[PDB]
């Protein structure tokens, strides 16, 4: 995996040694080259995981997340180079360096063979996101956004640190490949109960679980665009990745300890979708939609059937692309009206038709329109939960109803109706903005043609 | 109750509005033209019977129970004009009503498609930018202390000056763009 870590680290002399007008072009170009190279991780096998070294491996779960991570960096560079156009040159290079350092921590978070190195990288990803939110954020409450970001993600991860070292002292190793073959059945006891909670609540915060989700509609709202993109596309998915690694060790105590968290996620996907139906803030609507879609991923990990894990990894990749595109659309209108109020500027198809087409595509992929991989993930999680309990189809279908409702209400409110009379700075769509929308949507549309690469280790 | 020029409806205005609503809901009940015309002159005679009622309290009482009679005898789906609010073609063409400022954001390779039009748009915007400060100082030399009283706008009184706050009334989009 070192052949991607070293070009990611060479992006730092590539961004600090550039000409002052060339720092976006060079970083965009070479991060696109690294993302071109990221497809060499697709050397997967039906029996064996692609085990590089003692430190790194990449099975079919980490591989689409790595391609998505290495693809998201040029899109963040394109998205952030307008609102930072009046920034200091040194602060601009520091922003680019925080994005590169975050990519560096992510691409060896997903390839961590050993779980405490996963923990070190998994908590190292906070600090660039911390600096991005609480340096280049927008309004006054960006410091309360990162404070509840840093507190929730560390108070959940702190019992995880004791839990992984307890596995280290008892089993002998935190290699995932070793613990595939040395896993013991975890019985029913109170010690094993708090063991399960310590191993799970960190990723429950990072997904987020309903009830633990209150950091997210402030950390996504008060972030700049690259921060919101990476938060909704990768940093939520670190929790699903960690759960799919850690529920190997938590059997069969999961089969009766997962019930209250299955109830929390199955009801919070209804609650947060209803909350999306009544958001005045567009970026908050996309944030609560992200919570509502990750609740299904929590359910599919906690019921641990093969169809559930396939649907959960498909839904993580699909939702990463879709929510990144929706935040970029919301920023494209925030760069014109300077407000995130959704009811402020309406009728924008009368002024921006092609951007309204990108809004339509992102809304249709939001509500899981077939044959997108959004619907593949949504549908497989619904199949596995119907197998889990037949009564859960009511909550699943009701969630899908409310999902289509808030998706098309966002489409109607932002794009349709009568336009606003007292707003006259609505520029034509730049080539950069449509390039950003197309580089989101076209990979998402192409992954419907060959969906098997994003269906995880047990396709 | 809710009007742009004044704050209230007078008694005579409420009489005329009940007369018009009664005839429209009657025509909704009475589809054919001749049968409507028969019952419409019957209803007109019912209005004109108490036309000369000098007591304002008795006139208000007859108007109030006439509103009650009308509320009982209204049509459930009255005929709404199509471009009227509630009609079938109401606000249908608003998706074609692009405002006028979007012409200024055209590329010059498509502003050269209409040279006379934008060569005239420049002198329209010239007329607006040399009328603006004079009509603002017209507004602040006529508004009473404590703000304006009604929403009614004053006209231009001099020659050479344009009426104040005129741009989004003169340059509004057409009903068929």
């Amino acid at each position: 995996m070192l052949k991607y870590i070293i070009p990611t680290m060479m992006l730092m002399p590539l961004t600090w040694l550039s000409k002052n007008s060339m720092i976006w072009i060079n970083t965009t170009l070479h991060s696109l080259l690294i993302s071109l190279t990221s497809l060499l991780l697709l050397n997967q096998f039906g029996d064996n995981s692609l085990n590089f070294s003692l430190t790194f491996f990449s099975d079919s779960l980490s591989t689409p997340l790595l391609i998505l991570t290495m693809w998201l960096l040029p899109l963040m560079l394109m998205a952030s180079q307008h609102h930072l156009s009046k920034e200091n040159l040194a602060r601009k290079k520091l922003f680019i360096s925080m994005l590169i350092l975050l990519q560096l921590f992510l691409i060896m978070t997903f390839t961590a063979t050993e779980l405490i190195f996963f923990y070190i990288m998994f908590e190292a990803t906070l600090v660039p996101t911390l600096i991005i939110i609480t340096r280049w954020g927008n309004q006054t409450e960006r410091l309360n956004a990162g404070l509840y970001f840093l507190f929730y993600t560390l108070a959940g991860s702190l019992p995880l640190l004791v839990a992984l070292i307890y596995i280290q002292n008892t089993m002998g190793s935190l290699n995932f490949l070793i613990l595939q073959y040395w896993v013991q059945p975890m019985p029913n006891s109170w010690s094993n109960t708090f063991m399960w909670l310590a191993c799970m609540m960190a990723f429950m915060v990072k997904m987020p679980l309903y009830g633990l989700h209150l950091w997210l509609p402030k950390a996504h709202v008060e972030a700049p665009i690259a921060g919101s993109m990476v938060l909704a596309a990768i940093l939520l998915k670190l929790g699903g990745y960690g759960m799919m690694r850690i529920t190997l060790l938590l059997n069969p105590i999961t089969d009766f300890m997962a019930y209250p968290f299955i109830m929390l996620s199955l009801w919070g996907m209804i609650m947060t979708s209803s909350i999306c139906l009544r958001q005045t803030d567009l970026k908050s609507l996309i944030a609560y939609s992200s919570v509502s879609h990750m609740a299904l991923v929590i359910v599919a990990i906690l019921i641990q059937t093969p169809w559930s894990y396939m649907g959960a990894t498909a839904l993580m990749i699909a939702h990463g692309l879709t929510s990144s595109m929706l935040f970029c659309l919301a920023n494209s209108n925030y760069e014109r009206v300077h407000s995130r109020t959704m009811i402020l500027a309406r009728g924008l198809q009368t002024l921006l038709p092609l951007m309204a087409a990108w809004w339509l595509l992102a809304s249709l992929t939001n509500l899981a329109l077939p044959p997108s991989i959004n619907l593949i993930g949504e549908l497989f999680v619904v199949m596995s939960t119907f197998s889990w309990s037949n009564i859960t189809i009511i909550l699943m279908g009701l969630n899908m109803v409310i999902t289509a409702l808030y998706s098309l209400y966002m489409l109607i409110t932002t794009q349709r109706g009568k336009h606003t009379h007292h707003i006259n700075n609505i520029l034509p769509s730049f080539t950069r903005e449509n390039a950003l929308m197309s580089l989101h949507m076209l990979p998402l549309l192409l992954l419907s043609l060959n969906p098997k690469i994003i269906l995880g280790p047990l396709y | 109750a809710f009007l742009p020029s004044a704050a209230y409806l007078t008694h005579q205005q409420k009489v005329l509005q009940l007369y018009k609503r009664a005839l429209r809901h009657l025509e909704s009940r009475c589809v054919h033209r001749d049968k409507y015309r028969y019952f419409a002159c019957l209803l007109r005679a019912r209005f004109d019977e108490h036309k000369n009622e000098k007591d304002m309290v008795k006139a208000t009482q007859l108007l109030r129970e006439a509103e009650k009679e009308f509320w009982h005898g209204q049509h459930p789906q009255p005929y709404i004009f199509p471009e009227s609010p509630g009609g079938t073609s109401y606000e249908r063409y608003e998706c074609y009503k692009v405002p006028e400022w979007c012409l200024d954001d055209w590329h010059p390779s498509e502003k050269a498609m209409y040279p006379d039009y934008f060569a005239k748009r420049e002198q329209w915007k010239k007329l607006r930018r040399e009328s603006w400060e004079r009509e603002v100082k017209q507004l602040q030399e006529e508004t009473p202390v404590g703000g304006p009283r009604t929403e009614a706008l004053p006209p231009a009184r001099k020659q050479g000056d344009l009426p104040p706050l005129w741009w989004h009334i003169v340059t509004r989009p057409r009903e068929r763009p």
Binding site: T350, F430 | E100, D105, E110, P177
Partner: peptide
Amino acid sequence: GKRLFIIKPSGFY
């Protein structure tokens, strides 16, 4: 004849 100019946003970009 009597053709009317149609105000539409910038279709160049």
